[PDB]
Amino acid sequence: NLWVTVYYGVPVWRDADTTLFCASDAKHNVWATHACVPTDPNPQEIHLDNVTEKFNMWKNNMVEQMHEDIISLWDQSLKPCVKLTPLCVTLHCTNVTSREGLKNCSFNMTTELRDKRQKVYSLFYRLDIVPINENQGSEYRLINCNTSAITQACPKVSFEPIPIHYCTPAGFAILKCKDEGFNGTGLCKNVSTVQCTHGIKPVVSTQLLLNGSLAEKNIIIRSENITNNAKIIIVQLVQPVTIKCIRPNNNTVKSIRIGPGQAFYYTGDIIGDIRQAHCNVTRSRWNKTLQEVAEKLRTYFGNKTIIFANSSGGDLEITTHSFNCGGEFFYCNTSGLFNSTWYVNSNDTITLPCRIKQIINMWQRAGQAMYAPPIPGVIKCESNITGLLLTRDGGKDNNVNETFRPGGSDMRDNWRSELYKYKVVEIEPLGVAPTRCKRRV
Amino acid sequence: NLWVTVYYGVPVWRDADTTLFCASDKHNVWATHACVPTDPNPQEIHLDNVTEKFNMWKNNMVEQMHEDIISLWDQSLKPCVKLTPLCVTLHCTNVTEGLKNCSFNMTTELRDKRQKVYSLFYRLDIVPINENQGSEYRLINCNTSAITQACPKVSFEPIPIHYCTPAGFAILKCKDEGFNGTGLCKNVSTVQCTHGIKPVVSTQLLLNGSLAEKNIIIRSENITNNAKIIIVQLVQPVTIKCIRPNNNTVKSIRIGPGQAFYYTGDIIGDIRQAHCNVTRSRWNKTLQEVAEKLRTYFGNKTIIFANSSGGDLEITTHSFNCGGEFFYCNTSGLFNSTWYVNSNDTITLPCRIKQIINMWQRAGQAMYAPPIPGVIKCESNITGLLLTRDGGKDNNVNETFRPGGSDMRDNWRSELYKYKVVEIEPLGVAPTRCKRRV
Amino acid sequence: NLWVTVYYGVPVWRDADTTLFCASDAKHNVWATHACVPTDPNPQEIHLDNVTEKFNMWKNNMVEQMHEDIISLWDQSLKPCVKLTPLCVTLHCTNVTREGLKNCSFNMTTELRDKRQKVYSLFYRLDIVPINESEYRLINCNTSAITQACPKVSFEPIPIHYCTPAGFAILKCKDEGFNGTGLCKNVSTVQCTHGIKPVVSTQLLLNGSLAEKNIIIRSENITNNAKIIIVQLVQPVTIKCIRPNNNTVKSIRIGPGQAFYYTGDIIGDIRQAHCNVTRSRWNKTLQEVAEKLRTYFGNKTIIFANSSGGDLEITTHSFNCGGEFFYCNTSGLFNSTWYVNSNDTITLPCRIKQIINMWQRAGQAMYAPPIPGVIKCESNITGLLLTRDGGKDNNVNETFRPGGSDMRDNWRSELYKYKVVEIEPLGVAPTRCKRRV
């Protein structure tokens, strides 16, 4: 004979998705980290011996939920900033006079008094101006003007991706896989539970992962289906590859007041010589890094000639490497970093030509556009390349070789490299089991 | 000698007023995608021996639904191109009546350059700046509110919406056959929340609503009072078909950076007045039964119908939203009959199209319905009427029933008549012979 | 030996700030009192003794919460009004047919977007600046957009109660002559503070709470040379004000149905606005203030000067009389000196201002529409916001000047007898109790 007995506070859980709130280390930040609740100074991490749980990062809701949250943050930050609606005016632009990617645009902008106009000479990057009449010239309309209104990014706020800890509410937990070499999906043996994720820097990058988490002791390749050519392939590096970026153009910012008390920032003049922006990366490190990736890529799908090409072709935002450091938005051509072949057998830097874009659409949205104000002085940016976003275009049966093209055209993939170790679980404190007991009456 | 015991989870309630959330089974003005998906199985519990009292007039959920509908209408219009720039001098000429070929110049994306356009605006949406003088017309409601265009994608389709109360509350449903609106419902049933209610907006005639069970029923808080609306519900629907013959070719232009504006560019074929059809035999018989039942509440006086009261178009005409366009039909052809105790074929109702509207009668907001391309046809069912007796005089044998009401709440009151929200009181007390041991 | 025990409901509390919500007396008011929850018809003035809890108005967070809350209500009640963006147009002005009024003319958009109407309105010189050296420009046009205050809502301060959520109580200090930072006895407890009027004033408290039977001086550091010194009067010194100009308001339709108001003409001669106060009461009040001030510090030689200098906002009085805003020069109320030994009305000249930023915010500007006809507003002076200017060591005297430049001090003088605490009724204590099994 047996009787059912209920247990409260039982240590069991179930897969689930829920609303998540941040937590930042202790106003003028794009992610509103100051308004975010302060993080817990004690990282309460509890290990789970003998616990084996399966993780499916490609089917979770954390990245999908974080994607919407980040978009709402980017926008809630641009909401109170100056609206450059009056900037959509015909711009008479001419070749910059002091390599051909900057144009000297002269336009009539509104002034505080609605019945007066000010002529202002600004220098805009060609990538942000489109010819009004293709046949003629000296008539360039601001890009994104025929799709949505432009919204100036506030200059006092910073776009730096400081770490943010995504934490669950009370009664919920976030598991943390710690098995070394754990790929995208699998049964994690070294499972552990923490109050919430570590500092996840919300870096906005495309075609490459910057300042992200590194591997433990070996290269890790994660994907929901490696054989599927249409699926994204994320590679995590064990040894970071430092990349240095710089904008030699010593732009001189100038300010003008448009409308009632709304300032507009632009590039007045370039002091000294004008030189294109670029990024330096040690050839030995990158060349040696791909040697390991090619060696590891040859493991999942067998020994075949690994080849890397220069993107798949298309628009700048999806065929070039994006940046968000130094208050600027670079668009680097990574053709030099994926121009090598690797067989079974097998000063000193690689220069990446980069173009700067002011009017941008980071979330691939056509209903909203943002104008990044220029930053005075020669901006420098150094970061660590810790992950790569690869895609195999082997639509035709690969016989001896297949080309790997970096990209993905999706923003959710980059953040997946930082949340692959987690999975939200709803703890069920109630449990029932048979027992040899009967309550009194 | 009797002690007292306290009960928990007792089955009782009390009339209350609480916030109600919506529910539906992105592309609609009601924004039901954000609502909680309704449970497919309707949880209905029948109550035996219950004769709960009902009163739809003092019911508060009708006001809440009216307020929420206003919020969704404004929330849906909030992220849309603001036609504020259309407050320019309009030069219009007769079409090559109810339509005018208006011409003017408007701001293009680049503020520096303008663009000349030729749009066809209905006379109801255009008023003359110069009294009497020709030309120089301006867009109506430009002197009272900012015109806002409806995002072309979001459709005005009145899909069903379920009004559900949070936990701890309940909505009582009256199942009595032919309920008279107010009284003690002898057939009550508890449901977690109301059924799918179509929020179709209309006045002077209820469409696509619920039909009666077995006979026509009349509802009124005070039927003898002239100032109180008389909501009538039919048992058999009277199909009504409408159509605006104009092919209505639509044209689009970009005003300001990114915002687009749609308008009627040209009309292919002959221009014809919009109208609605109703079978004469069916409608004529409906008035017979309506007058037959109306004689029960009043004496044996003869019942006659008039052609509304007269005045503004928004209240004195049957206004319905179908096929993405708003019509304003002259219902004078329906209410033009007299009845006594003794006792090819379609009645045509002239209608006028209108783009600039103030659906909720608010002067602070204005709606601009974009023209729908191609001819549009609409087929709906008439399930109720809004009547108001003009008995301001001491009539002895006559009883004039003029369609009207003018209150938008009346539309939803005709459907929410069988619902009443009550807060659950799970705590009760009663005497009992017991002693709490130490 | 003894065993621990736990008691639920214990009458204890802990100092901790919490979110506060309003409560008004039971839509058309700037403070949105009707939209606010109603106040308790009978507040519980529960008596307590032997508590001797300490208070500190310069450290509590409730005063700061009110400052941010009041600003929110101002924006909440101001954003639905018409935005006067088209008013930022070049103004052509000439002297009124009197140096403080300028007969300005300009183009203003009518109901149509392509039609402008030439209007004639009178703008005070304080809200006008040259665009070059006749064309004049509206002030604050280069700082923020102007917004009109809807006449449907009045600026008259009405009492509003600030109540805590369930589980948090607001203590009420009632010690006689409560100076501030220290120990307070007779501390009563109520669900929430009484009705407090959110009056907007500068360097002089109006319609505030008076002292029980003696003047009170308070400050976070009375000995500091840069800390505000609030003073609470024992009896109120009534002050009268008036605008002799008989203004005639004219309205014009602008934009998509938006309305606008302005000064059309003046009936009769133009005379500068001013405020009166009985010299006998003011002299007696300041005479007694020196007596109470002599006990704190100084070489028994009190000196009063006419402010310390700066812009109009911090160097002059502020009012919100019947919708209009005044700015009076207080040089006449602080032009006296005294020692240990020791018609009939003092007048204060004032200048009317329409464009204002009462909250010292440069991101938003409010345009108060002119109220038609002459308007008067009698008020009671209940406190003073003074600060010592002892830049040199206290040898024989010290100078006291009105000011502060901080709007929080206006509320600190009213919320001085309140402190929010968190009720933590779950407590433990040794006992001989035993848990049966």
Epitope: T85, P86, T90, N108, T110, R114, D115, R117, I132, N133, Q136, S138, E139, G259 | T84, P85, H91, N105, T107, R111, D112, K113, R114, Q115, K116, S135, I255, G256 | T85, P86, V89, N107, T109, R113, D114, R116
Partner: antibody, heavy 133, light 107 residues
Amino acid sequence: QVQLRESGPGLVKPSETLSLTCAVSGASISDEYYWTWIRQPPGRGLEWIGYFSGRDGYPHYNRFLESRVTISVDTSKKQISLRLTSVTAADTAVYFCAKAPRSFLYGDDYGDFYTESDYFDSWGQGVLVTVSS
Amino acid sequence: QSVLTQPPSASEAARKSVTISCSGSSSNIGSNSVSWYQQLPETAPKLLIYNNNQRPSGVPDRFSGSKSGTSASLAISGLQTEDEADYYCGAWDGSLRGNVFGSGTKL
């Protein structure tokens, strides 16, 4: 300084379309100006025909001639064209291609407003147009 | 056709201050600029006064303009022999949606 110069057939038969052009020099054709066409019959008063905004890029014509004239401009070679359909003997006149400045009147959040064609700064040399068998 | 009106001819000797008048209605004269023009024989015209009384570059102070309600006039003084030409007044007509000129006053 801006130079205008007409060019077209001096003699045209009745009932067909009259096509003539006027070159532009010294200023870009797409500049902030109103390229207006004017005509003056022999010893009669001066009357307006239509204009083509260089910046707005749209034409406008007189209501009495709106159903007969169509103005077009070629930005490639900087020249405006006047095409008067169904010419008659009453249309004999010296056509002048004058420019009017699209001066800025006052701005607005949704767009700027400008003056209409008035106070022509420059006029063309003038082309004599006769119509008869 | 010319909606405005002015005397067909005001010819007379020189050395005085003749003043040619131009009138219209609220549609054209009483609503915008009242620019004037001069037309020498067998040649295109030229601008003399734009807006209301503002003079262009190259024209001497001899020529002046004025506006008064729905009327107008061109003021000149110290005339010479080269002034023998046809003068035209102009304004933008709101009702006609097009600028119109006067009948032409021959001096």
